Amino acid sequence: FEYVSQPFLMDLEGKQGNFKNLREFVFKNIDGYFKIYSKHTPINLVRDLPQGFSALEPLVDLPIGINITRFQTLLALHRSYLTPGDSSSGWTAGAAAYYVGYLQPRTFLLKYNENGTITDAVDCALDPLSETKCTLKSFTVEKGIYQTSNFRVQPTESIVRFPNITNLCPFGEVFNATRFASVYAWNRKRISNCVADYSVLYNSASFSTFKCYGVSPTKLNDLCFTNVYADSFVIRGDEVRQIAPGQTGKIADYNYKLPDDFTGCVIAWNSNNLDSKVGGNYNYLYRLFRKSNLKPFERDISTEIYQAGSTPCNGVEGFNCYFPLQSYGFQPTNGVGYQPYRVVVLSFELLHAPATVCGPKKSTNLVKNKCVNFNFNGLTGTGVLTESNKKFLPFQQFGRDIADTTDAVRDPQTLEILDITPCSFGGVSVITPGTNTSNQVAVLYQ
Amino acid sequence: NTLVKQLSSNFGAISSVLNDILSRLDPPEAEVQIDRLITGRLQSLQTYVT
């Protein structure tokens, strides 16, 4: 980027007397655009800024698209017979002053004149009068009491509480086992009394299919579950596309049907260097025919002759009689849709029992009597914590209110009951005798 | 009492607690659920005002 304007010849004589030129600039760096706004005005003052109001018009919007974090101004010094010395010392500088101010996101109420020139503005956070003016959308307010805004005490700390569990449960066995089961006889595994490690599992082995419903994969390390389940099978590539709730498919897909509202996700990866035999591998078996559909999360091990035709087969395997179970044909040399994939399903459930499986958050100290953030096994919010007098039976975890909101909880570590009472909050009222008479106001917190 | 009770409703979303939705869902999938909750509560407030 380079730009040269038309040539000119500015005056270079050092003027005496008082300052007479004021030059205001606004520099912004937004979305790769360097925006410059400029304004020039004749003045007469020895220091400080004039009190008059003035607007700034856009000049250039240069599209560079780079960082700008530090900046420095350049000054032109004077050399003559009155400044003896070398280049480092033989110099003088004429009188010149400059002011630097920093912007920040604010809301302004601007007034446009008939010609569209901004002649006045109000900063909505300077003082109660300005905020009231912004609320009413006017530069003058009559007398009375006005409801302007609200307030709330900001939190001062954050606390995290997790159960005292140290042993890391092995996800390996359901992932690096020498052999798994068939599609129809899909296996199940329970996981409990664990500290979860979904972090490294996401990207360690360069998985193929990883996609989750009802929970974000990056947020899996922030939630506490109970009795994490695991499924397992190996199946063709194409059916992997319909291993998902609310989706139909073949009878093998009806063997393992997911519920409409399923929390968790499926993890699939490639398998050709262990499930491919030079002579062909046919150990794995799948279903091909059934009477009707199956309920979600249901297993079948029944093996009976399929009897769709109007003839009683009675185990003859004759014409119009088919064995419902068929064996997959897997060879190292086949189509791209013919290599088996190993699939494991993780399912989750919430708010049923004390938490037992969740990730490694270092539990922090407990601070009470001051309303702060908290995290009680995934129960977040804000509020003052204090001792409670309500007696919990040994099997009870927490209590709730009419508004279906938590107001009492049990500390997972020391098994202590605590109350929850959010910070004090309210509206704000401004009492003013009107801008016409005076600019004094009173503030009332209700 | 009815206005306060109206906060304990799904309105079609996965959960009726806004912090729960924010805790376990990324913004692109959380926006639609939050919108459903917002429109339900907006109707519940307009009825009371009327």
Binding site: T405, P422, G426, Q446 | -
Partner: peptide, 30 residues
Amino acid sequence: PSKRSFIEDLLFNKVTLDLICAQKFNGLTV
């Protein structure tokens, strides 16, 4: 201390004006 006649006291005792706190915590004020 409250300068109300006897009949006014009887009228006040016959009208019955935590439930309130739960309402207060959801932005509802009286």
